Write a protein that binds this ligand. Structure first.
Ligand SMILES: NC(=O)c1ccc[n+]([C@@H]2O[C@H](COP(=O)([O-])OP(=O)(O)OC[C@H]3O[C@@H](n4cnc5c(N)ncnc54)[C@H](OP(=O)(O)O)[C@@H]3O)[C@@H](O)[C@H]2O)c1
Ligand SMILES: NC(=O)c1ccc[n+]([C@@H]2O[C@H](COP(=O)([O-])OP(=O)(O)OC[C@H]3O[C@@H](n4cnc5c(N)ncnc54)[C@H](OP(=O)(O)O)[C@@H]3O)[C@@H](O)[C@H]2O)c1
Ligand SMILES: COC1CN(C(=O)C[C@]2(c3ccc(F)cc3)[C@H]3C[C@@H]4C[C@H](C3)C[C@H]2C4)C1
Ligand SMILES: COC1CN(C(=O)C[C@]2(c3ccc(F)cc3)[C@H]3C[C@@H]4C[C@H](C3)C[C@H]2C4)C1
Lengths: 262, 273
């Protein structure tokens, strides 16, 4: 059972926190009395988020602007954020590259950009954050989607990057379990969220219910705080019930008696 | 010449026959050894036209020779690295010119990988995504016009590590999961765009290839399935236009791998766009 006091005094990074779900997470964390470091490209929008974080009761609030297309910026950002807060308890990996609903034809550029921003930068940010996370027995929160678990048309590049997140983070979670690394990994599988970007992208074409961004952001924080392996948040109760793969968890437990690492 | 007809009649979506590959124009990547080499050998026996690729000219030459001996209608190789996106794009054009078209594209190559705990090896994370996933995308883009012409097939070789989580294969698993997300999404696109190009995702367990046996030695203790039958099962699925192929030593694995809930969610969401 979650309690907002679990985040009181915690040192948290939130990526893509200038708008949408990311901004909402920063706001909830601020209300909880956490130390926050927010990032995105827009200095001006980040400044506004930092100001209202302080107004909500954040123990401290800072921003560092830059693009996650740059792996050097991603690595340096974590070092600077950790130096500002004097450590790190939670790393929330939320940013994605701008994407839309379009058929795939020959845009290898958009496939590469999505893999770099949505997946490779999460790996670099994890590598940079891990020593501090090992010190605090902290958590890694990875924001994904239904399109990161099941197939949908018009999101091929986006889906590839979200699936990669699962393959990578679920594999290191198994490694941490056998290596006795007390760092939790929360994969967040989300449905349609009423953010300005998502509403604009699904206008007309798609006909489905959007869930509120405020509660979504809170559910993500809850899972990370409770050290839940996975979080599921969608409008439909049919979706939430079918998204779980119990056979996958059984296969993994059956195969855990095949390797040696001692 | 003074003949015509169709191999694909009643039952041809369920029961395989080697004659379905007779005269077919097939590309096999990473075909100098392992499963890839075995696929080239089966296709040769079936009387298909084959174009093999891998980096080693010398090993590819040997594979080409054995294919011709087995009864391949034609057999050629083009050597190069799949780290090079220019080579990947040009390879398909050259292979298509050598065969006069393309019926099946078998995406099988991977970068050299081992069983090791994640250790911030960023170069291995990147090279894995590039060779194992991004080159498959470039090869697909290059091949698609000819596949559209022949109502052809794309065969994507993946792993159990491309469906479920295992330790010591983080970057490899990321690259194999990405293939699923990408190829399963475009399969849905082809269905609504009326693109008659099938996509077969192959989910393989441990296979007795020299590479895999060497890599698992003293780290992984599990039953290895024969490479010969594995290569045949992959060909079967592509020929039958099966969405997915599963091949593993354990019968418990073959029963648990399928995700019926995933197929239900997709069918439920198909009435939203
Ligand atoms: N909303 C939904 O329907 C939905 C559904 C499923 C999953 N999700 C997941 O939720 C997360 C957030 O989505 P959202 O809908 O809240 O998005 P959003 O409102 O568009 O915001 C994305 C954030 O990422 C930042 N960003 C974009 N490009 C960047 C770059 N190159 N470098 C660094 N930051 C960059 C943006 O700020 P700047 O432009 O100023 O850089 C922005 O703050 C994503 O991981 C998404 O996959 C959302
Ligand atoms: N064996 C198993 O247990 C197993 C299990 C599940 C799935 N699989 C999948 O099966 C497929 C084949 O595996 P395998 O065990 O048969 O592997 P393998 O014998 O080691 O073959 C890999 C092939 O790819 C080539 N290759 C490597 N790097 C390359 C590059 N940069 N550019 C182009 N070609 C390159 C290799 O030849 P060169 O070095 O001469 O280039 C070789 O022909 C892969 O997709 C693998 O993921 C295998
Ligand atoms: C900007 O995209 C934001 C919106 N995001 C999603 O993940 C939501 C979905 C999507 C994906 C990309 C789009 F462009 C538009 C919609 C994705 C999961 C669900 C099924 C479909 C695929 C449609 C919705 C809801 C990231
Ligand atoms: C290059 O080796 C080839 C072998 N390959 C596999 O995919 C097989 C596995 C693996 C993965 C990478 C390795 F290096 C070693 C083993 C993978 C699927 C199964 C469970 C485990 C993960 C162990 C085996 C069997 C690529």
């Amino acid at each position: 059972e979650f309690r907002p006091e679990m985040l009181q005094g915690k040192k948290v990074i939130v990526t893509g926190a200038s708008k949408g779900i990311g901004r909402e997470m920063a706001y909830h964390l601020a209300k909880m009395g956490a130390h926050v470091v927010v990032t995105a490209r827009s200095k001006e929008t980040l400044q506004k988020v930092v100001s209202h974080c302080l107004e909500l009761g954040a123990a401290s609030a800072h921003y560092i602007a830059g693009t996650m297309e740059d792996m050097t910026f991603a690595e340096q950002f974590v070092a600077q954020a950790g130096k500002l807060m004097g450590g790190l308890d939670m790393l929330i990996l939320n940013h994605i590259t701008n994407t839309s609903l379009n058929l795939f034809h020959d845009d290898i550029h958009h496939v590469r950009k999505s893999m770099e921003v949505n997946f490779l930068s999460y790996v670099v940010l994890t590598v940079a954050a891990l020593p501090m996370l090992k010190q605090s027995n902290g958590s890694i929160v990875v924001v994904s989607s239904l399109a990161g678990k099941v197939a949908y048309p018009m999101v091929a590049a986006y889906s590839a990057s979200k699936f990669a997140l699962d393959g990578f983070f679920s594999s290191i979670r198994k490694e941490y379990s056998v290596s006795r690394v007390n760092v939790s990994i929360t994969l967040c599988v989300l449905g349609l969220i009423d953010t300005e970007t998502a509403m604009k992208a699904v206008s007309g074409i798609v006909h489905m219910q959007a869930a509120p961004k405020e509660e979504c952001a809170l559910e993500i924080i809850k899972g990370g705080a409770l050290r839940q392996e996975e979080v599921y948040y969608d409008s439909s109760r049919w979706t939430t019930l079918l998204i779980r793969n119990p056979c996958r968890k059984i296969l993994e437990e059956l195969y855990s008696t095949s390797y040696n690492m001692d």
